[PDB]
A paper describes a structure:
Microtubule (MT) filaments, composed of α/β-tubulin dimers, are fundamental to cellular architecture, function and organismal development.
S. cerevisiae Spc98 has a structured N-terminal α-helical domain (Spc98NHD), as predicted by AlphaFold2, not visible in the inactive recombinant yeast γTuSC filaments. Interestingly, S. cerevisiae Spc98NHD is more compact than the extended GCP3NHD/GCP6NHD folds alone and thus more similar in size and fold to half of the composite Mzt1-GCP3NHD/GCP6NHD structures. This observation could explain the absence of Mzt1 in budding yeast as Spc98NHD is more compact and its structure by itself makes up for the lack of Mzt1. The γTuRC luminal bridge density can in principle accommodate a trimer of the Spc98NHD crystal structure, in agreement with an AlphaFold2 prediction of a trimeric Spc98NHD oligomer (head-to-tail). Additionally, we observe densities connecting the N-terminal base of Spc98 and the luminal γTuRC density, consistent with our preliminary annotation of the luminal bridge as a trimer of Spc98NHD.
Author numbering: 0 to 95
The structure:
């Protein structure tokens, strides 16, 4: 029953309330899933993606931590190589 893009949308908003606008969080989720479903992952395109959004963001201790939780959440996600394990991982973060 879990579908990937709205699940990620919900988790990111729970990690980082109000950090991104609705429109930008959706664009971010779409770019994340595009990288996640790419055939072969090269280097670490994920961190550069996140760094790009972080340039547009606020310096404050709250938002710094929000971005750290996002990048650790996504780093582990991009380590998961099969779908049932991914569902399990996401279902854990759905408690937040």
């Amino acid at each position: 029953a879990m579908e990937l893009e709205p699940t990620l949308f919900g988790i990111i908003e729970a990690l980082a309330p109000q950090l991104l606008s609705q429109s930008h969080l959706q664009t971010f989720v779409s770019d994340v899933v595009n990288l996640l479903r790419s055939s072969t992952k090269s280097a670490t395109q994920l961190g550069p993606l996140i760094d790009f959004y972080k340039l547009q963001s606020l310096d404050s201790p709250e938002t710094t931590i929000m971005w750290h939780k996002i990048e650790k959440f996504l780093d582990a996600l991009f380590g998961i190589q099969n779908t049932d394990d991914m569902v399990k991982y996401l279902s854990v973060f759905q408690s937040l």
